[PDB]
Structure formats: C-alpha cells, structure tokens
Amino acid sequence: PQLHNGLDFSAKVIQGSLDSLPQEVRKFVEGNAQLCQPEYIHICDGSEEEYGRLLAHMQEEGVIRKLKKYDNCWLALTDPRDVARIASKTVIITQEQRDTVPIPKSGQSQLGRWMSEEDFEKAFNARFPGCMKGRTMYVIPFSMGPLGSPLAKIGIELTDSPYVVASMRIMTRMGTSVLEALGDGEFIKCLHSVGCPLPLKKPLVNNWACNPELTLIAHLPDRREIISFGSGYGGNSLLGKKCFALRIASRLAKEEGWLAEHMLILGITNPEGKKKYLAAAFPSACGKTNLAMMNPTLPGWKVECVGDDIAWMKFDAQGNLRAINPENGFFGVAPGTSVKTNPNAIKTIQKNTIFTNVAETSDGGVYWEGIDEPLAPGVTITSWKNKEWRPQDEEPCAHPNSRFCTPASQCPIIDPAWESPEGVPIEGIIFGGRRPAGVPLVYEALSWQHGVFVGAAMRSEATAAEHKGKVIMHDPFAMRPFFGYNFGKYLAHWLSMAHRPAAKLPKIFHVNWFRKDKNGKFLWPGFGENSRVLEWMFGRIEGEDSAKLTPIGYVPKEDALNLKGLGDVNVEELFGISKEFWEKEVEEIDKYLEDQVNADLPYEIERELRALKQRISQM
Ligand SMILES: Nc1nc2c(ncn2[C@@H]2O[C@H](COP(=O)(O)OP(=O)(O)OP(=O)(O)O)[C@@H](O)[C@H]2O)c(=O)[nH]1
Ligand SMILES: [Mn+2]
Ligand SMILES: [Mn+2]
Numbered sequence: 001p002q003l004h005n006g007l008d009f010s011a012k013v014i015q016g017s018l019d020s021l022p023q024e025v026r027k028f029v030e031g032n033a034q035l036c037q038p039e040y041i042h043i044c045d046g047s048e049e050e051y052g053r054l055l056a057h058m059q060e061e062g063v064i065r066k067l068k069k070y071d072n073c074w075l076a077l078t079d080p081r082d083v084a085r086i087a088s089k090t091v092i093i094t095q096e097q098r099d100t101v102p103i104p105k106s107g108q109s110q111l112g113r114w115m116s117e118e119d120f121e122k123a124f125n126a127r128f129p130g131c132m133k134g135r136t137m138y139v140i141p142f143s144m145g146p147l148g149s150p151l152a153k154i155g156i157e158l159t160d161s162p163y164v165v166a167s168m169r170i171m172t173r174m175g176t177s178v179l180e181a182l183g184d185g186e187f188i189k190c191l192h193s194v195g196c197p198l199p200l201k202k203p204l205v206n207n208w209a210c211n212p213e214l215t216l217i218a219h220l221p222d223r224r225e226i227i228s229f230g231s232g233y234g235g236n237s238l239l240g241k242k243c244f245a246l247r248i249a250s251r252l253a254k255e256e257g258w259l260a261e262h263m264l265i266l267g268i269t270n271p272e273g274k275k276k277y278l279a280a281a282f283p284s285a286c287g288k289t290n291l292a293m294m295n296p297t298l299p300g301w302k303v304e305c306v307g308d309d310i311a312w313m314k315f316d317a318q319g320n321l322r323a324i325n326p327e328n329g330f331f332g333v334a335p336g337t338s339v340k341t342n343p344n345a346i347k348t349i350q351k352n353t354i355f356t357n358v359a360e361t362s363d364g365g366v367y368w369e370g371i372d373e374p375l376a377p378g379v380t381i382t383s384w385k386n387k388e389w390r391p392q393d394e395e396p397c398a399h400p401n402s403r404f405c406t407p408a409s410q411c412p413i414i415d416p417a418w419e420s421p422e423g424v425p426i427e428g429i430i431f432g433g434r435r436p437a438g439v440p441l442v443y444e445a446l447s448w449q450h451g452v453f454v455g456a457a458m459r460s461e462a463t464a465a466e467h468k469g470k471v472i473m474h475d476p477f478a479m480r481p482f483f484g485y486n487f488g489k490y491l492a493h494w495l496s497m498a499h500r501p502a503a504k505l506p507k508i509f510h511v512n513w514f515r516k517d518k519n520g521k522f523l524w525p526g527f528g529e530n531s532r533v534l535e536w537m538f539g540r541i542e543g544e545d546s547a548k549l550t551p552i553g554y555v556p557k558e559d560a561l562n563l564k565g566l567g568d569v570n571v572e573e574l575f576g577i578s579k580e581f582w583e584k585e586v587e588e589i590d591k592y593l594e595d596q597v598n599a600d601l602p603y604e605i606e607r608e609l610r611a612l613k614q615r616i617s618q619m
C-alpha cells in the first residue's frame with residue numbers, strides 16, 4: 001500500500017505488534033514515531049516478566065538502584081532541576097483564553113495558565129522533532145479506573161522513559177487487557193519525551209535524562225491530547241497522575257456531567273458496623289494520604305482506603321454520588337510518613353515499591369525527614385543528592401516532596417470495594433488545609449451552595465520554587481494547580497449538581513488540623529485522633545442533634561466530640577470564632593474572587609459571600 005517502506009515502523013518493533021493495535025492507536029504510534037525518531041518501539045503488555053526485565057535494565061544502566069533491605073524495592077535519584085511539577089511551564093491550550101482561565105484584573109491568574117494554539121505549535125516544533133533518537137518509544141495502553149467500569153477512561157502514553165513505564169504500571173492499569181478493552185473506542189493521546197535525544201547535547205546529571213530549559217507540560221482538551229516535554233518526573237511524566245486525572249478529566253467531566261477532583265475516598269465504619277464513604281479535598285502537604293489510610297484512635301472504629309488523591313464522581317440513577325479511584329496505586333509524599341503518622345502506608349511500601357529522591361541507609365533501607373525510626377549506631381545515610389549526610393546538616397536527606405510509588409492492592413486497609421466498577425456512594429465531602437489562626441477544627445456547611453462557596457474560599461499555608469517559606473494562599477477545592485478550564489465555570493458546574501432531580505447531595509464539611517496557639521504550637525494532636533472529628537461528621541450525616549449554629553456554619557456542641565484521652569485540649573481556642581478574624585476573612589475572599597474570577601463568578605457564590613458577611617456583622 002506504499003511507494004517505499006517509510007511510514008511502516010514494523011522493523012523497529014521489539015515487543016508486540018503494530019498489526020494488533022487498533023487503527024487509531026496505530027496512527028498515533030506511527031505518526032509520533034515518524035516525528036520523534038525513536039530507535040525502537042516497545043508495545044507494553046503490562047506483564048510481570050516485562051516489568052522485572054525493565055527494572056533490571058534500568059539497574060543494569062544505573063538509572064535505578066535496588067533497595068536490598070526490602071522485597072523488590074527500588075530507588076531513583078533525579079537531577080535536582082527536575083524535582084516537581086513546574087506550574088509556570090504547565091499550560092492548557094484553547095481557542096479562547098477565557099475558556100481556560102478567568103481574566104484577572106491584575107497580574108497573572110493564580111487559577112491556571114493558558115497558551116495560544118499558535119504559541120504551542122511553535123513550542124512543539126522547537127521540541128519534538130527527532131527527540132527520541134537513539135531511545136525506545138514505549139507504548140503504554142492504560143485505564144484510568146477499573147477496566148470496563150462505565151466511569152473509567154482509557155489513554156495511550158508514548159514515552160521514551162522506562163522509569164515512566166515502571167511507574168505507570170503501578171499507578172494505572174496497563175497492558176494488553178487495556179488494548180483489548182479499548183477496541184476502536186476513543187482514548188486520550190498522551191505524548192511524553194524527556195527531551196534528550198542521543199547523542200546527548202548536554203551532560204547528563206545523576207543518570208537522569210531531562211531538559212529543564214525546554215520543559216513544557218501541555219494539555220489540549222479539544223484535541224483529547226496531553227503533550228509533555230523535558231521532565232522525567234511525577235505529574236510531568238506519568239501522564240495519568242494529574243494531566244489526565246485532573247486537567248483533561250475535569251474538562252471531560254464538565255462536558256459529560258460528572259466531577260474530576262483532587263480528593264481522597266475513604267470508607268469509615270462505626271462500632272455498630274454502619275459504614276459510610278467520605279471524599280476529601282486538601283492541598284499538597286495537608287494530609288489526604290494520612291486521612292485516607294487512617295488508623296483511628298477511637299476504639300471500635302475502622303477506616304478503609306478507596307483512593308488517596310483523585311476521585312471521579314458521577315450521580316447514579318438512584319441519586320447517589322458514586323466515586324471511583326481512577327488510579328491503581330499511591331504516589332505518596334515520603335517525608336513525614338511513619339508508624340506514628342501513617343502506619344498503614346509503612347506496611348504498603350515495604351515491597352514492590354519505587355522510591356524517588358529519598359535517602360538510602362547503609363544497610364539498603366529508605367530514610368527521610370519524619371520517618372520516626374532511629375537507626376542502629378553505625379548505620380550511615382546517603383542523601384537524595386547521592387552524598388553522605390549527618391542529622392545536623394543544613395540540607396534535608398530526602399527532597400521535601402520526594403515520593404513512593406506503591407501498588408494500591410498492597411494497602412492492608414484497602415477497601416474491598418476500591419475497584420468496584422460502580423463506585424462508592426459519597427455521603428460527605430470534606431474541604432480543608434493549613435490555617436494556623438481563626439478557622440476551627442471542623443464546621444459544616446449550611447447548604448450545597450454554601451458548601452460550594454466553602455470549597456471556593458479555601459486558603460492554605462503552602463510551602464519553594466514559587467516563594468520562600470510558608471505563605472497562606474487561595475487553593476479553591478484543592479484544585480488551584482489543576483483546573484482544566486475556567487474556574488468560574490467550574491463553580492457553576494458544581495452548583496448545577498443541586499438541580500439534578502433526586503440527587504442525594506453529600507453533606508459538606510471544612511476541617512482544620514493545623515490551628516496553633518499564640519506560641520506556634522498545634523492545638524489539635526491530629527493523625528489517628530482525627531477519627532474523633534470523623535465520628536462527628538458521621539453522626540451529622542445520620543441527622544444527630546450534635547451541632548451548634550455559628551456564622552460560618554455548624555460546629556460541634558459542647559461535649560459533642562469524644563475527647564477521652566485528650567484532657568489537655570484547649571477547646572475554647574480550638575473552636576473559637578472571632579468577629580475580627582472573620583471580617584478580615586470575608587474581605588480578603590471578596591477581593592480575591594473579584595480580582596481572580598470577576599465576570600465568571602456565579603451569582604450563587606456572590607450571594608453566599610454576602611450572606612456570610614451579613615452573619616458576621618451580627619456577631
Ligand atoms: N499537624 C498535623 N499534620 C498533619 C496531619 N495529617 C497530615 N499532616 C501533615 O501533612 C503532611 C503530609 O501531607 P502530604 O502527604 O503532603 O499531603 P497529601 O494531601 O497526600 O498531598 P499530595 O499527595 O501531594 O496530594 C505532613 O507534614 C504531615 O505531618 C494532622 O492531622 N495534623
Ligand atoms: Mn546501555
Ligand atoms: Mn498524598
């Protein structure tokens with residue numbers, strides 16, 4: 001069917017067969033093989049054999065090290081220039097800027113970053129041609145969600161990184177069964193290159209291929225495409241993790257009437273054996289993963305994990321808000337993780353786990369700040385920078401957002417319905433973040449509309465490449481880095497859920513684990529003690545008379561919370577609501593919503609802001 005042997009890359013296939021791919025999958029693979037000029041094409045099958053060899057190869061090349069203390073665990077240390085998502089290089093392309101972000105009255109939008117089609121075409125042409133020369137293009141067929149679930153979506157990721165392949169096997173469902181399930185159906189096109197064709201133009205740092213200068217993570221929702229160049233790390237390279245999971249999915253969700261959110265999903269069971277599912281949106285550094293796998297301090301209570309990071313939610317015919325975890329593993333922040341703060345994570349990560357940018361102990365174990373396991377005298381620490389490290393050094397031993405990448409199936413408190421194709425019925429949505437002052441331990445929204453306002457108004461003390469130290473910033477719905485489209489329209493979409501006939505709208509709560517006294521000490525012990533707060537939400541969903549009305553919403557009554565074992569807890573200060581603080585809070589929210597959202601702000605949000613101002617004025 002051709003004049004030469006040009007567009008057929010069969011000769012370069014080293015696993016699988018181009019003939020076995022669906023027609024549109026093949027076109028995507030061969031079009032990008034022509035552009036990127038990889039040496040080989042490896043069609044991934046997801047098999048155990050594929051994985052072990054892939055790992056052994058990366059070991060054979062010094063890309064990863066085997067962690068000899070554990071069962072089949074591996075360490076990758078990156079180039080320090082490639083250590084997180086870079087917000088300024090993360091862009092969404094649409095015809096009109098306003099469909100992607102509201103137009104800010106001053107400075108930049110804090111709610112997204114748009115690039116024109118024209119600008120993106122130029123950027124793409126400056127990056128991808130020839131970018132995989134001398135490397136293998138891996139073809140990763142993957143499902144976001146349980147295979148065959150009506151809530152699941154399929155992608156194909158092309159990548160030149162075996163680290164991506166290994167990690168995507170953990171974090172998504174991938175391999176031949178996905179290609180079988182897909183047939184000729186639609187899929188998200190995911191294109192990734194580390195941007196270091198051979199022979200290398202620049203020196204390789206720490207055996208970690210990347211192109212910081214040209215790093216660009218792009219999303220083209222109208223084309224169903226994600227195109228990412230120059231980073232090998234995390235949400236920039238595992239294109240399911242955030243690019244698909246939140247940015248593309250939230251736009252699909254908008255079109256199709258569902259929700260794609262930065263939320264954990266947990267199941268909680270009381271001492272009577274009654275069970276409920278809760279979703280919670282907190283920003284990075286605010287403890288979704290701790291909550292999602294909680295070991296509850298309260299006797300007789302049980303928490304089970306459905307997911308720790310992404311929730312895809314859609315109302316079913318009965319009106320239940322059904323949530324799936326579209327991921328297959330946990331991509332968790334390592335620092336701060338311990339038997340104390342997260343015993344169930346510790347049990348999950350002892351096998352078949354890939355660690356990135358953590359420290360290594362001389363006996364081949366993992367180490368990081370806050371691990372709360374002292375070492376035997378004589379055991380030394382190699383930092384994530386590959387150097388020897390002593391506890392009194394300036395630098396930390398692990399990168400502060402270093403990660404583990406671990407199969408979800410290995411969590412000992414994994415919910416037996418975590419892969420159920422219909423999802424789990426969410427009865428409560430929880431918002432929260434780090435507020436050192438003013439915001440009490442827990443409150444409950446007065447209505448759905450108020451609850452959406454509470455999500456919209458979220459602020460949190462965030463912590464390096466965008467500012468020095470900790471600073472309180474807006475992070476509505478914990479989605480500030482992740483909106484697929486105009487935030488004002490996202491709020492409208494949330495509000496519209498109230499007009500679905502027979503919808504069983506979840507109760508909305510806001511939490512604050514991080515309130516501090518005058519001297520900077522935490523008022524609330526947190527972690528497993530947060531079961532006490534979950535108990536109250538549970539009772540509130542059951543309609544128990546355990547709430548006192550305040551201007552910000554409902555709070556627990558005096559003695560409504562079980563504080564047995566916690567007699568030193570300053571409840572006065574921890575639940576205190578100051579008129580002065582809240583006058584300032586509503587003024588600041590007003591200014592932020594005006595500046596950042598303006599003409600796209602829904603009426604209902606403006607009304608909730610007025611209502612809150614009014615309630616505060618009567619204090
Ligand atoms: N004081 C206090 N700190 C907590 C609590 N729960 C979690 N943390 C802290 O939150 C941090 C861990 O949160 P992360 O794992 O970054 O949060 P996450 O929401 O899972 O973030 P991503 O995985 O990036 O989405 C550590 O600093 C913990 O000490 C709590 O109940 N109280
Ligand atoms: Mn080699
Ligand atoms: Mn997490």
Ligand SMILES: [Mn+2]
Nearest residue numbers: 262283284309
């Ligand atoms: Mn996250």
Ligand code: NA
Nearest residue numbers: 077206207208
């Ligand atoms: Na390395």
